Symmetry: C2
Subunit: 327 residues, 2 copies
């Protein structure tokens, strides 16, 4: 069996993960699920958002499925669970796919996930606060390679988004992205981070594989979300050399926690990207979701009246029906 660590988190985390696990169970019986706590509770109790011993099982698992975690601003010494797991497990590539769920058109974003303004060199001293945006040859290269494989796989091009005009690290990063895309015969279109925000809302579907630095990607990927109607249908993968973690792009949504209305599609489609990572199909889940939305009542964030459970059952329904054409 494939062993998959599951980390529901908190807020709506549990609800949408329950959704995504049940859908996985409905397409494959080849995966064992092991549940771990994580978040402020774990921190309050142990000093870390994840326990050391759990982190050691987690890192030896085949893949991780992650819900969402509340990172409270006013809790000293506390670091985000997802940011922590990203660095601990070596997850340098973040891939976010925003779908127009009717047409099947996609915005594809590759966010560098290990460095940039997330590298973590910051300090205050004598009324001077500083954060170091670090781009590194190995970091630029590996994420460039990752982005070219996504380009190749789609017969498409790379839109590298930057502020190389102002940021010496983006000048460096651009160079490297262009070399590897050269080595591999992939086209690289320039885009500048400020004007690209306009192109992204007005002409979403024409940019191929978007690649950018960590924080830039964080920003762009939330913006791209407007073209899917809700952030809560968007999935992601966080990939490293020996493992990967899958989570919906959305967050804790603590205000609607436990009310039965959260959108599970983000988690579910993240479950799909997980099956792909293991070499199971995922296509079935994607087809099932697409199949369901043609006439299914959706969640309130999408404008519908449906409960979380109606969507979950609805999609499982499509999956059971889909099973019988391995053919």
């Amino acid at each position: 069996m494939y062993r998959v660590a599951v980390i529901p988190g908190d807020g709506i985390g549990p609800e949408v993960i329950d959704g995504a696990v049940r859908v996985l169970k409905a397409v494959t019986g080849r995966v064992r699920f092991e549940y771990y706590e994580g978040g402020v509770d774990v921190f309050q109790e142990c000093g870390s958002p994840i326990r050391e011993e759990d982190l050691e099982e987690i890192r030896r698992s085949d893949a991780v499925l992650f819900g969402a975690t509340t990172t409270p601003f006013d809790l000293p010494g506390y670091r985000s669970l997802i940011l922590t797991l990203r660095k601990e497990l070596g997850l340098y590539a973040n891939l976010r796919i925003i779908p127009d769920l009717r047409t099947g058109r996609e915005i594809v974003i590759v966010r560098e996930n290990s460095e940039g303004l997330y590298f973590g060199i910051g300090a205050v001293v004598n009324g001077r606060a500083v954060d170091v945006r670090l781009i590194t040859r190995e970091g630029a290269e590996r994420i460039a390679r990752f982005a070219v494989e996504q380009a190749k796989a789609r017969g498409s091009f790379i839109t590298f988004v930057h502020k190389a005009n102002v940021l010496t690290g983006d000048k460096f990063f651009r160079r490297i992205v262009r070399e590897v895309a050269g080595e591999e015969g992939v086209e690289v279109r320039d885009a500048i981070i400020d004007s690209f925000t306009i192109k992204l809302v007005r002409n979403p579907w024409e940019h191929g594989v978007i690649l950018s630095e960590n924080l830039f990607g964080d920003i762009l990927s939330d913006l791209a979300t407007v073209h899917a109607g809700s952030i809560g249908i968007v999935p992601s993968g966080n990939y490293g050399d020996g493992i990967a973690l899958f989570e919906p792009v959305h967050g804790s949504a603590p205000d609607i926690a436990g009310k039965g209305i959260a959108n599970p599609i983000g988690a579910i489609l993240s479950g799909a990207m997980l099956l792909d990572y293991l070499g199971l199909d995922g296509s079935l889940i994607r087809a099932a979701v697409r199949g369901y939305v043609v006439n299914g009542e959706l969640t309130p964030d999408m404008g519908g009246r449906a409960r979380t459970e109606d969507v979950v059952r609805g999609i499982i329904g499509e999956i059971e029906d889909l099973l019988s054409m391995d053919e």
Copy 2:
């Protein structure tokens, strides 16, 4: 007389500045205009995008009116004219006002303009590229004060946009913004840079005085632009303690240069913000623009068939008619 340095720049720069100067001349005869070259030509010839001796007249003028400048990516040692003038003239506050020109609703952005990722400490060394995001007590304070005056003046609040969760400099900056807004009894709403991109496209009009770091503001202010239909209607002021510079938010647009179709409204309304800065009215220009757009054919970037000249004349028309109610 008021002495105003005018820097047309290049690309569509000249065209829209010609527009904005003529409109100014039509509302006040109390301003002398002095023209200076700037951009790559000046660089190629002298090593600097602005000549030292001109920069010395410019800095002793009462205000600056600036068109737009082409900053070519592949020109070694060349720094942006506008970025250069921002630092040389001490222009730490950038104010961008995006208008819905029918309703009169506004998005108000205060971008810190002297530091952050624009401070200019960057380096590469042994495959390691770095840029230092610097926030400084004096920089945080002065821009916070500037933002509270814009809040007070509007009987409104401040939306401080950040990534304090990840960026130690934004934690520092937040603190300072909250203290001064406290001293002054102004409300400060938190917003996070990634999710705020969603709020900004979906609920543009409800955020009061948006304040952020330099690069964040650069990014947000281009995005806000989608709610005005074209970037080319949006004006800005760059303010420092002894002087200010006014420029449309848009850029060179070299591809449509010299074709007669550029939108001058951005420059014109920037001319308005200039009159306000001198203590002339500006209201007249704003009223004239609003007056003109109710039935005037607009430029191609707004979907119309009008030439640059039709809009310029049209607005002057409204101004001449407006003059006779000092009353």
